[PDB]
Every structure is written in C-alpha cells, then in structure tokens.
Symmetry: C3
Subunit: 242 residues, 3 copies
C-alpha cells in the first residue's frame, strides 16, 4: 500500500513511494512495496518505461538513524536495493521531487534518467556520520555527476539543494518540485515512442560498462564500510545527528 | 569532385565535402571522395592538421532514408567510415558548419577536435526510426559529450540545435555558421606550430584508450543493431520519416 | 627552509613552497623541502588534511628552461614528483594561489582537491616547446578536467588564466588569489571533521582506479617524451621561450 504501481498509457508506468511515517525511508513496507512493484514490472512484457517517485517533500530518506544504531549493535543487515533498479529490463526515470539521502540518493542515481527538484536537499550521508559509503556510491556518483562533485559530496556527507547542484553543472534536469513528475512523465512518453525490444536492447548495451564493474565495486565498498562503520566513536556520532 | 583537398599553409589542409544532390549524405561519390582525400593525406608526410568540413547548410547527412529502405531488404552493406578518421595519423578538426545526422554526426565526433554551428541541427538519428546505433556511437558520444547528454541523444534520436547543446554544456566550441571554418582554421594553425612527429606521437597516445575499446564496441553495437533494425515495424517507421 | 610545514589545528596542516629565486620551480631546495615535509606527514599519525600552497604570484613553476637545456645535453634526470602527492595517505588540497606550469600544474592536479586563482596563469607547457608531456599528464588531466579541455591544453601548451578555465566549466573552485588559501583552509577543516581512519580508507578507495593505471601511464608517456624531446629542433625551440 505504501508503494503503488499505476499505468500512465503507452507502456509508461509510475511507481510511487508513500510511507509518511518513515518519510520514504527504507522501512520494511517500503522495501516490500518496491520489490513487489518491480517484480510486477518484470512479469509484464507490455511496459516500456518506469517513473519512480516519492511523496510530498520526500523522494527517499534511505536508512533511518534508528536503523544505523541497530546496525552498530549488529541487529540488522546491510540493505542492498541496487538490484531492483539495476535488474529492471526497461528504462527507469527517477523523478526526485523531494529530498534524497544516502541510499535514497543512490536509489535514484542507479536509474537511467534522473530529475532533481530545485528546492529539495540531496546528500550521500555516510561521511556525515563518520563512515564510508555502501552500494557502489563511488562508481555511480563519479559516473553520473563527475568525479569532482562526487568526491566532495562523498568526503563531506553534506546536504545540497537541487539549485546548488545545477549551479555546479550537473548533467541532470533540476526543475521546481511541482514540475518534477510532469517533466519525467513527458520524457517518459518521448522514450516510449520506441519499440520495447529496442529500449530493452539499448538499456542493456548502455549499462554494460557499469554492470561489469558493479559486483566488484559493491563488494569493495562493503569491505571498507564494515571497517569504518564499526569503529568505537561511530555510535556517538550517529547520536549527535538526531 | 564532390570531395576536394586544399592546402592552407603550414601543413594545414582542408577536406571539403560538397555533394549537393544528397546533402552531403553517405552517397557513393562522398564515400569515394573521402577515401581518396584521406589516402592522399596518408601518403603525404608534410601535412600536420586536417580540417574536415561540408558545404552550405550541411556537414554530413549520413545514410539517406532511401538507403535505409534498401537495407531493410538486404540490398546494401552497413557503411563503416570510422577507419578514415580513426586511422588518420594527424589531428583532424571537424568544422561542422552545418547539420550532422546519424553517421554524419559520428563522422565529426571521431575527430580529435570538433566545432559546432549554433544554428545547425545535430542528431544521433537511429532511434528516431526505432532502432539502435552503429559505429560505436555509445563509446564515442559518452567519451566526447558525457554520458547523460549522450544517453538522451541516443535514446530519443531527436534533433538538437548547436545552441541547445552549448546551453547544456558540451565541451566543444559552438559558434555562428559563418565563423565555424575560420575558427577551425585558426585552431589548425595553432596546433601546426608543433613538430609533425610530436603531433603524430601525441595523437596516438591520447587516442589509445578509445582505440583499444573500439573494435569490440563496433562489433557489439552491430550485433544489437542487426537485431533491432530487422524487426517487422521498422520499414514503416522509416517511411513515416520521409 | 624554502618548504615549511605548519599546523593549523584539528589535524589540518599546511605545506608552503617559497623559493623566490626559482619562482617555486623544481629547484634542488624545492624538491628537498617537498620530500622532507611529506615524509614528516608520513610519520605523523595525527594529521588529517594537507594544504599544499606556494608564495606570492606562484604555486609552482615546474622545471626551468635552464633545466630543460641541461636535459637536451643529458646532464639531468627526468624529475618525477608524483609519488610525494600520490603516496600521501591523507587528503591533500592544492591551494594554487598563483601560476602553475608543466610539472607544476601536475603537482597540484595529483591532489585530491584543487583550488585555482582567477587571475593566475595555468599551463601544461610541454608542447609549447614542441615535445610531449611527462608525469601521466594525459591520465590526470583527462580525469580531472575532462578530455576536451585536457586535449586542447596538452596539444597547445598554451597559458590559461584561472577565469578562462572557469568560463569553460572546470569542476574546481576558481576564486580570487587572496581567497585561495582561506577557501582551502575552510574546506580542510570541513574534511577534518571525519575520523582519520575513514579519511585514509576513503582516499585509498577513491584513488584506486587512477592508482591502478598510473605506473603504466607514467612509463608510456616517458617512452614518448624521450622520443619527442630528443629531436634536433627542440633545443632551439626552448631557447626561443626565454
């Protein structure tokens, strides 16, 4: 119920994340709804484009600070949602009409096209808490945003408004929040003019370089994360971010 | 006669494409003239820079729609003009004073330096007709234009004015059509100040990464093109583009 | 004495190059001071960030023309200062408050973060004299500046003001000379908020791709440099640059 799939016509579908209690964080119901909605897409051979979007002021909050505290005590797994986006056969547009944090930003950046909101806040959060990324952050961020913006965003963990990112020349559209989904929907109908077979073939071809590097990047980042996350001072740093 | 080589001084030469009947498309006379002019360059050890340019409102139209229709019926080969640019020992400047479409855009983007016209139209056409690129489009476009502009241009097949491309921050000069060739000629004399041996050595060095990936990229794209081009609905899509 | 290390607080240190006789060129005292100051950093496990900076109107002049003349006669080694920057365990910010030429520009571009001065002049000098780069120039410049700016800067050897580079959209900050060091110092304190272990781990991770390509790039460029540098006309070209 927190993640709904709706048909927009011409094989364009929308996956909408709405879990207001967690602010579209990676809650159990969000992860279940995403896996369900994307498996529905996988069974359907008529769909051509997916637009992934959130609700209100939120695209995706990623892992909560509560989750991170549970993790310092080894009570919870590392979540890897990359497969859902990466193994989807058809192009995905991430319409990030609201804020995206940590794994929430990665969730959008794994997509084939990304639309930012001008007013919203975007962050690879990890180093805000003093530890290194997971989810092949380095690979995807350097590929999509360029190495210098990626490097600064990764080292600092700091928050960037959509408009600040445009001003530093990211290749993605950065429009007003009320325009984000509409824009994605227009781009979606544009792409969906093509035969589905060509869209599937093209996506596989264009993704091959990143796809080939991904398993190793994921494993390497995790090795480093497990070391840096599990240092004594980390729990207290997380606490100071509440 | 449709492709002429002229000496500009200081080892800078110009290859001018003028086939008005086909609009500088890949006509038999254009392909013959290009192969001839570039083999002339290959024999000459005095030349330092080539400026490749078209006529009037056209740099290069690539394969005609008529050619594509002949191709749906297996009457014509896939044209691969990459060798002519890629195997040239000396730097080439593509002065694209007019429109460049499909293989015509690639023809310019294979060059070491590229100059765009503000008013002209630029497209990787393939997906306009519903099928995937040939000629290592993905490789070259992502390398020269960045992955996000490349991806959008490849998925859509749509037409972009020089000025629209500058506004989205491509690293190439985008000047008025009447300025394109002059600009290329000035850059050409600048480069030609260097010893020819250093120019040849530097070009080989800077090209090595792309050169190493190229045969595989070419083969892979062709494999996919042969599948997507030869689907039943394609002939009719081409027909609707006349 | 020409290179001094000073502590700025919170594990941020500054390495200041001041050899006014050579204009911060790669003089014996500059190379000795750099090696000393960086080995001091290597022994200290408390430091988190280094800011590398020059004096007055100069960051680094690289190899003098006098040195190059000695080199045409085989009297001097090729200098490779890359190790000092590349083997430093902690992030380095190159605050290039003044001009940087040839190996002097590379010295800064090897760093994890780079700040340019608006008014200063920046050049990969090699081809100004008619010969090819050393120090993995192609690798680092294409990675940090993008292939098209890198290519033009490498082919021409020409001089670019900080402000000209910003106008062509380099991802680095380009601020007034009086602001360069302050800016670097602020960025330095920002980064130094993180645990040193995470900073060391992250730097290694983010550097791995370039680090893996570097020995081969260095060797390949040197092979080509040794050919192009040692051609008969080169000594006279250097002479005309005095």
């Amino acid at each position: 119920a927190v993640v709904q799939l709706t048909e927009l016509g011409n094989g364009v579908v929308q996956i909408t994340m709405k879990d207001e209690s967690s602010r579209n964080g990676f809650s159990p119901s969000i992860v279940e709804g995403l896996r369900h909605c994307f498996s529905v897409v996988a069974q359907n051979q008529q769909y051509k484009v997916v637009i992934l979007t959130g609700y209100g002021n939120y695209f995706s909050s990623g892992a909560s600070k509560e989750y991170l505290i549970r993790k310092t005590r080894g009570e919870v797994e590392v979540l890897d949602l990359s497969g859902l986006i990466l193994d989807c056969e058809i192009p995905i547009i991430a319409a990030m009409q609201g804020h995206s944090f940590g794994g929430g930003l990665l969730l959008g950046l794994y997509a084939d096209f990304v639309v930012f909101s001008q007013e919203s806040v975007y962050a690879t959060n990890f180093m805000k808490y003093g530890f290194t990324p997971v989810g092949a952050t380095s690979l995807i961020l350097r590929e999509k945003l360029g190495s210098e913006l990626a490097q600064e965003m990764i080292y600092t963990g700091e928050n960037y408004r959509g408009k600040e990112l445009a001003e530093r020349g990211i290749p993605f559209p950065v429009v007003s929040r009320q325009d984000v989904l509409n824009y994605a929907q227009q781009l979606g109908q544009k792409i969906a003019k093509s035969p589905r077979l060509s869209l599937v073939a093209l996506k596989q071809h264009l993704s091959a370089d990143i796809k080939a590097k991904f398993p190793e990047a994921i494993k390497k980042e995790l090795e480093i994360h497990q070391v840096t996350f599990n240092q004594p001072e980390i729990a207290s740093r997380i606490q100071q971010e509440f």
